[PDB]
Design a protein around this nucleic acid. Structure first.
Ligand SMILES: [Mg+2]
Ligand SMILES: [Mg+2]
Ligand SMILES: [Mg+2]
Ligand SMILES: [Mg+2]
Ligand SMILES: [Mg+2]
Ligand SMILES: [Mg+2]
Ligand SMILES: [Mg+2]
Ligand SMILES: [Mg+2]
Ligand SMILES: [Mg+2]
Ligand SMILES: [Mg+2]
Ligand SMILES: [Mg+2]
Ligand SMILES: [Mg+2]
Ligand SMILES: [Mg+2]
Ligand SMILES: [Mg+2]
Ligand SMILES: [Mg+2]
Ligand SMILES: [Mg+2]
Ligand SMILES: [Mg+2]
Ligand SMILES: [Mg+2]
Ligand SMILES: [Mg+2]
Ligand SMILES: [Mg+2]
Ligand SMILES: [Mg+2]
Ligand SMILES: [Mg+2]
Ligand SMILES: [Mg+2]
Ligand SMILES: [Mg+2]
Ligand SMILES: [Zn+2]
Lengths: 112, 53, 123, 44, 92
RNA sequence: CCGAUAGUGAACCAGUACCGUGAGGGAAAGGUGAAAAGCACCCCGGAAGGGGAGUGAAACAGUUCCUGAAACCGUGUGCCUA
RNA sequence: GUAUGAGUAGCGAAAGAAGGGUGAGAAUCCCUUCCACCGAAUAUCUAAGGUUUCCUGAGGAAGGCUCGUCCGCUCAGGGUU
């Protein structure tokens, strides 16, 4: 007996600040409704977060044999990853820093 | 035109009170019984107003 | 009034003439919401010319329709143009209906730029 | 406008080339001191 | 050089084999071999009668295999055509 | 005497990469495990990446991989706050 | 090494539209029609200069101020008589 399952997507190219704004919608909701929210939210993080949630449900029934119809999104948070450092040539010979940030996305589903 | 003092953690968190985004106005389809947007063609069963489009 | 569509009075004139001809030829097209609320007026004002059947009405509608072939028939393979179809095929369909020859159905946002896309169709 | 470097294959070898360094006493001193550092390329 | 030192190996490609029926044979020769030496080297090895030889020089391609940069060998390619009243060379 | 910001500029393909027309200037970069035994097989996914299973003393040792501090970024909650 | 300014400035002169196709995924790739721009040039050659950027088959980690099924990018074979 485990009663919960999780899935992690590590070093996703999207920035942490742009992904936390979508996580805040699905936290604490049922997996049936949470999938629809990510489907009808026009942001670039919706496809990425939706595969993590779907993968968490997938091994919540193949590995631990739980009910798909009773799962809820217990936990969902975004961490940071290794950033890529780039440059942008500005005017008058100067250069400016650019941060290509990554993130870790973790979703935990469990019974109600 | 230049910040006099750096912004604290509390003041930077208070300002982001309103930078959230709202919940979509979705609805249950009458035919296929799954979620869709109001006043929109259902993307799954391809129907609107009970007639296929 | 009327809405400017992000382009000057010359681009806007050309944009409305291409979109109004495509709805005649294909009868069902994908556009954006604001771009479809505008050709909803230039197309129905164009069927009304086709419901007259005059030479004066035909010459007036010929100043808007683009000169492109809808399809080719062998009556002697002679092409058929968009102005012929409007006055001989599309207009006789609505000989009894007074107004509202088009309808709009909403689809959803577009991936590239979040634009709201709709179906505008000629029934 | 126009910049300070205008490339030319011939002009580069005639001023900085190996045979130009070997023709003078102080040009052979440049090669001697570049060999001392063990530089990959001597002259141009 | 010798006859076997001037000529190194044949070239077997789609372009090279598309002209074998035309009695044209593509070889890789020594980098310092003239057009005339290649003519007499072929007749010594294969005993064919040679009509023309055409040569061209290839540079070395800059190649990378991970943090290491270098060049491949530079080539000298010769195309030999023979008289119609002569035997053939079997690349096989 | 030093122990990877130290000790040669260089413990690693270093007078290298890079910078300059040129003379010339000149870096950063060490550590899986005793042994690759470097994850057969199954599931989600186009893949990356994960959850099991297995090897191992240890996988919270999984290809900047011993140990892993602080700044910085988050989730949950006991007391307070318009 | 990591913050604040902040999801703020910017995204570098310009006309695009629709219909098919491919694809896990298309405003951005391919095809078709219409429209628009240059035209003592934004057309055709050729020196200097650059050194494989040329062609074909695969690829989508990084580069491309967005996207990418695409590329002057990555890999493997070729090509200069
Ligand atoms: Mg400059
Ligand atoms: Mg004008
Ligand atoms: Mg001079
Ligand atoms: Mg030099
Ligand atoms: Mg020649
Ligand atoms: Mg040191
Ligand atoms: Mg140390
Ligand atoms: Mg140089
Ligand atoms: Mg695994
Ligand atoms: Mg895997
Ligand atoms: Mg395990
Ligand atoms: Mg064990
Ligand atoms: Mg040890
Ligand atoms: Mg560690
Ligand atoms: Mg810590
Ligand atoms: Mg401001
Ligand atoms: Mg502003
Ligand atoms: Mg631009
Ligand atoms: Mg040249
Ligand atoms: Mg090409
Ligand atoms: Mg990109
Ligand atoms: Mg593909
Ligand atoms: Mg390609
Ligand atoms: Mg290439
Ligand atoms: Zn439906």
């Amino acid at each position: 007996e485990v009663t919960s399952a999780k899935a992690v997507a590590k070093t996703v190219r999207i920035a942490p600040r742009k992904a936390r704004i979508v996580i805040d919608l699905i936290r604490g909701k049922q997996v049936g409704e949470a999938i629809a929210i990510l489907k009808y939210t026009p942001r670039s993080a919706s496809p990425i977060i939706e595969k993590v949630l779907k993968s968490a449900i997938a091994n919540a029934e193949h590995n631990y044999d739980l009910d798909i119809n009773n799962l809820v999104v217990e936990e969902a948070f975004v961490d940071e990853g290794p950033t890529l450092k780039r440059f942008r040539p500005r005017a008058q010979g100067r250069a400016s820093a650019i941060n290509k940030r990554t993130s870790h996305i973790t979703v935990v589903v469990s019974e109600v | 035109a230049v910040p006099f003092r750096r912004t604290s953690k509390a003041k930077k968190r208070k300002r982001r009170t309103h930078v959230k985004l709202q919940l979509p106005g979705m609805n249950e389809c009458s035919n296929c019984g799954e979620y869709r947007l109001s006043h929109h063609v259902c993307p799954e069963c391809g129907q609107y107003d009970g007639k296929d489009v | 009034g009327y809405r400017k569509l992000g382009r000057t009075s010359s681009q806007r004139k050309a944009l409305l003439r291409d979109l109004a001809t495509d709805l005649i030829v294909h009868e069902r097209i994908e556009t954006t919401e604001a771009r479809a609320k505008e050709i909803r007026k230039v197309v129905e004002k164009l069927i009304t010319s086709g419901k007259k059947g005059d030479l004066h009405a035909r010459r007036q509608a010929a100043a808007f329709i683009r000169h492109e072939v809808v399809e080719v028939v062998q009556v002697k393979n002679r092409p058929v143009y968009a102005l012929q179809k409007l006055f001989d095929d599309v207009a006789p369909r609505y000989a009894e209906r007074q107004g509202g020859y088009t309808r709009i159905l909403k689809k959803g946002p577009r991936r590239g730029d979040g634009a709201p896309m709709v179906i505008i169709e000629l029934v | 406008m126009k910049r300070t470097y205008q490339p030319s294959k011939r002009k580069r070898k005639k001023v900085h080339g190996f045979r130009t360094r070997m023709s003078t006493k102080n040009g052979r001193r440049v090669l001697a001191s570049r060999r001392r550092k063990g530089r990959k390329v001597l002259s141009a | 050089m010798d006859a076997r030192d001037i000529i190194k190996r044949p070239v077997v490609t789609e372009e090279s084999t598309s002209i074998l029926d035309d009695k044209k044979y593509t070889f890789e020769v020594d980098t310092r071999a003239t057009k005339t030496q290649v003519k007499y080297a072929i007749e010594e090895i294969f005993d064919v009668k040679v009509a023309k030889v055409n040569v061209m020089n290839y540079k070395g391609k800059l190649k990378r295999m991970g943090r290491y940069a270098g060049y491949t060998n530079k080539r000298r390619k010769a195309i030999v055509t023979v008289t119609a009243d002569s035997k053939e060379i079997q690349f096989f």
